[PDB]
Amino acid sequence: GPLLLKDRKGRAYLVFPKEGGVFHHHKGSVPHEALLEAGPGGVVRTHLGEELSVHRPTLEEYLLHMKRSATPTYPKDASAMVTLLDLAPGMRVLEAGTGSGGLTLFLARAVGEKGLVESYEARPHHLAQAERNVRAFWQVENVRFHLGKLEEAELEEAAYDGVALDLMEPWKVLEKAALALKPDRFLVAYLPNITQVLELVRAAEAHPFRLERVLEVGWREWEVRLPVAHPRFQQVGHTAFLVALRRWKGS
Amino acid sequence: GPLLLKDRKGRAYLVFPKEGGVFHHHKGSVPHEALLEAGPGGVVRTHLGEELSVHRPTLEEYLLHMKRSATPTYPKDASAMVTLLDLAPGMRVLEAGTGSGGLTLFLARAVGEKGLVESYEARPHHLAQAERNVRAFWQVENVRFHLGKLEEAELEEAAYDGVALDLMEPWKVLEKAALALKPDRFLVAYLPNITQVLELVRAAEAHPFRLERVLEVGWREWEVRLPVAHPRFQQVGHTAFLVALRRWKG
Amino acid sequence: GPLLLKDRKGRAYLVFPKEGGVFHHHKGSVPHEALLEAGPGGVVRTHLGEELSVHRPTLEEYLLHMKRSATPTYPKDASAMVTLLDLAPGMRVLEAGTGSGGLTLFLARAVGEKGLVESYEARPHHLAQAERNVRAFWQVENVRFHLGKLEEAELEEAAYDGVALDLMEPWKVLEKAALALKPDRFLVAYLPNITQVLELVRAAEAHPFRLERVLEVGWREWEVRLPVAHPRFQQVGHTAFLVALRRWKG
Amino acid sequence: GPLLLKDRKGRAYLVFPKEGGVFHHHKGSVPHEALLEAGPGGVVRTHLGEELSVHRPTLEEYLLHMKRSATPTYPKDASAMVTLLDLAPGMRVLEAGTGSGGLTLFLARAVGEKGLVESYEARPHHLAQAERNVRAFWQVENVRFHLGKLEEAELEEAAYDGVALDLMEPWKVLEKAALALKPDRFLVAYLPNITQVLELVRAAEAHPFRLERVLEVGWREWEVRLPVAHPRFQQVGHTAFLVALRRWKGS
Ligand SMILES: Nc1ncnc2c1ncn2[C@@H]1O[C@H](CSCC[C@H](N)C(=O)O)[C@@H](O)[C@H]1O
Ligand SMILES: Nc1ncnc2c1ncn2[C@@H]1O[C@H](CSCC[C@H](N)C(=O)O)[C@@H](O)[C@H]1O
């Protein structure tokens, strides 16, 4: 399990500890052993008043700092997608594209060791990084990764409890998703542009799906250091829209 | 388990099906047998002409429609709280107050059958309803309910992976929460008023927590039925602030 | 001019005082003479026990309560539109459609007695009500009303300092607006649907405008009555998008 | 009247043209005469595909680019304050502190040549810059500037149609503002911190004012370059709260 270090300026660093390893930093390098000794919740004092706080990274912190090729789903959105997909332990969820494994991790927590994340990724380098990212943080073998286009997947009809999409052209996978998804259950797509949203809404009218939700998730952060207290001057204003479709009654 | 009925104007109704049972609304009645026979995503019509779609409710739907003692945590907030608490399967999470069991259900899904929700509620009538709400929707025996004030709980030290609070005066449970919480893990409190937030922040100065987050969750719904496409004219403007405090190692 | 009455639950009522006139509400009646005698910020009580405060309405208050043909531009948006149009005293601004005269009033204040609002309205019943609404609140003769479609207006070239639009199909008036608007000045359109916004943007590709802004205005109200202090549970979620196009010099 | 130049990268520059003046820029310097010749709405082509678009700056553009000491009120907020103050031509509005003259300009447009902005500023260097900023953009002599604390001002009772505040400790000027402001008219204060808001709300309970509004103005910008269309990824999340008080009935 990696560590997250924060310095006094609030800069964050993801460290994968190894014996003989050294964390380099402008106010003093620290052997990895010192980090492990301090442990999550602890500190390592260095030079000129500097102090590195040591943390077990939350899944949010991990997504935000992990290596990536494809930009991962933002934590606020991945969190909402799991709820909109109504995922509970033991469920089977279809995902494309794996990307960098950010959403994959959220999905994998939600369905747990008896559940399944069936994840597809078309690009081999993307998939390799995603697999590293997932495995470095999560040891439960409840993700089945597939190299290939979701359009071409061999899937059991009505075997999946939800379908999570994060890809540029979700209309292309709606036929496969409609086949996979249990009646009355949900597909939820993440899309940056309202034009993409409208295109998906129109495309879904050619499939057994009913539009249920189009929403924007906002996590409006405050800066509070009493007596200072105000919404942060600079916010992430937008990441993507979430589009939820419900699968038509069966047969 | 429960069924959810949806009408044409979006409105939803929770039904607990029984033999010879009848769902009664202003727009007519439907026998419970008809609902059971309808299947997932099926439709029924009352004699008065009301068309109703039949569903197994999502957790979000259930929270919003289940019988309430205290108002439950809204789904957008319970969702964010689970993420801010960083709950993974097998974890042990402390909660107060159980209330109506809404947040309890989110916490219980997050930690799974190998984890534990340790949930406290001061008011017996509230706890009884919460236990009913939880058991009607969730069959996994991973919730341990406790009658009493969290301030008066007998808790194991550094035994909990998170502390979830939804109560009026969280400053009063800070000592107990700090005792229970493992180093580097979170207390996350749900608070409607910014004054409560500021009081919690000030009180937390006397306890082994760093303030990490104060945030507002918004789920801004759009209406899209082309040509129509805009954020909904009416939204939930505010429910509560979320405050995240991270326990340090002494 | 008009008076505004406010009750205890925040609700407001516009009254036009006349000799022997009586304001009638569900919670009783007040003679118009009593309202006139009350003074600014004074209170009256109906026989039924309703307490009402007496005010000269603000423009914001007037817009929200005046008799309507078409729904007027909301105050938060009319306010932003005046700024995006960059209206200063003495300027000449083109408007369509007059509607109920809400935006007309904002525009007329901005340009002042030395400026001009040139306002077009296709529907005679709408224009008649708008003229009434404007004249009841504003005595400055700086508004020239015109019955007709803006697309069919006879306009002087490069004679206008801004073009304010609140109508369903602004793409249809782009040719006329481009003719009328001085170089470097703005057309600002109020549009409820994002689809309208995208259609306007696409249509504007064939006219001498650069797209400068597409924005949503929000005025997020708080309730503050200590201990209570939070954004209001219920807000206006959306009214319209504002689109600003800047005329270039050919 | 100054010009605002924009280059192809979207960088904006405020230029006060003068004969013999030269605008310096990495892809080619341009004599001020060329700028004036192009005029608002025109362009000056320079090197390597660069093009400077020439503009008459809007008041919004001016506030955002003008020299400052004190940070001016943001345009979205100044716009809202004028509406909340219900300012119409001919009115008399009290202001403190002048700062850099941003809000002053909004107030001066609203009340017009027959109106009055009575503006107070305690700090001489601030006032000097504010006066330059106002005079460079606005030639109407409807602003009376005062060097000094508003607390110490000689004011006519019930002579002002509105009171606009942008200063750190508005509670200190409430006695003077209550004296100045006509019954049933408004004071509106701009405050960054919710703690300041609460302090003002409590302080106003010692004066003949009724709390009417506490609000946050948001102008949520979109990026639209078809087929791209989404709320901007990065927004100004917060500037300040606006607090509106209504003056009690007279006598
Ligand atoms: N039809 C398709 N089938 C499988 N993968 C696809 C696909 N279309 C796009 N992709 C892949 O989908 C990914 C989108 S980025 C996904 C990011 C991911 N949610 C995360 O959190 O890390 C890219 O890696 C792209 O290669
Ligand atoms: N100190 C305390 N210890 C235990 N319960 C408390 C408490 N203070 C308040 N409560 C209880 O906390 C509850 C707050 S309402 C909680 C709602 C809950 N999150 C849900 O989703 O259903 C009330 O039922 C109240 O009785």
Ligand SMILES: Nc1ncnc2c1ncn2[C@@H]1O[C@H](CSCC[C@H](N)C(=O)O)[C@@H](O)[C@H]1O
């Ligand atoms: N092409 C056109 N020319 C003139 N008026 C038009 C028009 N298209 C629509 N309209 C008019 O535009 C109005 C839109 S409602 C405008 C409301 C107005 N801004 C207010 O604040 O009161 C309607 O009255 C409609 O009849």
Ligand SMILES: Nc1ncnc2c1ncn2[C@@H]1O[C@H](CSCC[C@H](N)C(=O)O)[C@@H](O)[C@H]1O
């Ligand atoms: N009591 C007081 N009387 C006069 N000026 C005051 C004051 N308290 C603070 N100030 C001044 O108020 C200013 C606040 S910054 C004001 C910015 C201004 N709204 C603008 O748009 O440019 C500072 O210049 C400060 O010196």
